Amino acid sequence: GEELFTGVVPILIELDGDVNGHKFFVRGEGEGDATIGKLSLKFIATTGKLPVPWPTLVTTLVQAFSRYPDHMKRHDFFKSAMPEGYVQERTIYFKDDGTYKTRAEVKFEGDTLVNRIELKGIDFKEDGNILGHKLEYNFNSHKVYITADKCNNGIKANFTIRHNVEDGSVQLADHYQQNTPIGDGPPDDHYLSTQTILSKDLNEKRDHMVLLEYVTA
Amino acid sequence: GEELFTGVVPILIELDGDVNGHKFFVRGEGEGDATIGKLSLKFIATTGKLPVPWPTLVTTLVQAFSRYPDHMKRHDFFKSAMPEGYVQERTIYFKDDGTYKTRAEVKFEGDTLVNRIELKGIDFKEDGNILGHKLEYNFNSHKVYITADKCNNGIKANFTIRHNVEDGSVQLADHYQQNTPIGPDDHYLSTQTILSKDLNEKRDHMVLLEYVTAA
Incomplete structure (x- = not known):
């Protein structure tokens, strides 16, 4: 199913999010090239002002685009179960703060890859690093x-993610993930390196996100 | 726990079955020898006329008795957990027809081996190969x-079982099974089973004789 990933692929990402009861939704659009593992996407808050700062969500939003070298082709299963797809479950414990529960399904719908995900946030502290x-x-x-x-x-x-805090400190987010094939599918332990950059379209009135990411194996 | 199976062991088999709401029950009795893998059993419909023909249930009806050759003794998990026993869950998809859900517990009760099973049948087609x-x-x-x-x-x-249809065609039953201990490398079992009837029995009945071996 790598033929699906050669060249450019359109991407749709959708979110239903409930953090301590704050009901909000995010819609994402863009494209990605598995050959070069680049993701170019713009995310939109359809529910106005986000309760949580955008950074916490960036991981919960396609490992199906990561750059696997020629000698490592047989170790990428994000592509293997495609087009049928796979489910992504995660428990995200923010140290000394709340916790996210996430469930995601990644599939092809037509020629477009789609990520529809449900998010629930629990036990986050007011004026804490996240809610504040x-x-x-x-x-x-x-x-x-x-x-x-x-x-x-x-x-x-x-893994452990490092979110930079305004005051100079750092808030850690421990991640635990599970992926399962939905139809029929296909690695030895091997690793992905991610660089991600944030920006804003100055021609955008609503709360928004421009994402550009480089992921390799 | 193979000492439990050397020579003859008495067998009691009970089922609660609900196919499309049709509630029925069957009681089976007989004996089996693990050494020679023979099953001799007589099953009785306590609920009169069965909605479904007997063949569909025969698989749901003790692998423990299967003939494991001496060099394959350690690969029997049916005897291993005995006397404590094991659970058997099955999903049986009859192609182009309905589906069975089965949950079975197999244990020693005294000196007698017992299989008590809950059966639920769903989405079987009226006047189909099964209901008809x-x-x-x-x-x-x-x-x-x-x-x-x-x-x-x-x-x-x-695996896929082939039920012979009266018209000459064949009905396939795809099986998916799960076993768990309550307290082997890949290897296979060959089954031959024969149906017959006691001429001295008024109710709906089936006499089963089965030979199961390992390879």
Whole structure:
């Protein structure tokens, strides 16, 4: 199913989000090239002002585009189960703060790749680093550690993200992930390196996000 | 726990079955030898006329008795967990027809082996091969492909059974099975089963004789 990924592919990403009861929704559009692992997407808050600063969500929004080298082609399963697709479950524990529960399905719908995801936020502290929007509009480089799951016929991944705090400190987000094939699918332990950049279209009135990302294996 | 199976062991089999709402019950009695893998059983419809022809239930009806050769003794998980026993869950998709859901518990109760099973049938078509009693009074030879369940510490098995249709056609039944201990490398079981009837029995009945071996 790599033929699906050669060249350019249109991307639609949608979110239903409930953080401590704050009901909000995000719609994403753009394209990605698996050959060069570039993602160019613009995300839109359809529910106005976001309760949470944008940074927390960037991970919960396609590992199906990551650059796998020629000698590592057989180790990418994000593409293998395509077009049928796979499910992405995550538990995200923000240290000394609240916790996210996420469930995501990644598939082809026509010629477009789609990510429809449900988000629920629980136990976040007021005027805390998250709810108080004390997170800087930025991102660092991170390594995504991937391991096989012969039990649930998929993959688990475990890592720590560094969100820069306005005051100079850093808030950590521990991640735990599970992926499962929905129809029929296909790795030794191997890893993904991500660089992500934020920007804003000055010709945009609503709350928005321009994402450009480089992901390799 | 193979000492439990050397020589003769008495067998009691009970089922609660609900097919499209049609509630029925069957009671089976007989004996089996693991050494020679023979099953001799007589099943009785306590609820009169069965909605479904007997053949569909025969698989749902003790693998424990299967003949494991001496060099394959460690690959029997049916005997291993005995006397404590194991659970058997199955989803049986009859192609172009309805589906069975089965949950079975197999244990020793005293010196007698007992299989108590809950059965639920759904979406079977009226006047279909199943509901219309269009299945013949017979059975063919099948291979039960067994694989380990390191996740649920048991066994899974997947195969296709061929039920002979009165018209000459064949009805396929796809099987998916799960076994778990309550307290092997990939290897396979070959089954031959024969149907017959006691001429001295007024109610709906089936006499089963089965030979199951390992390879």
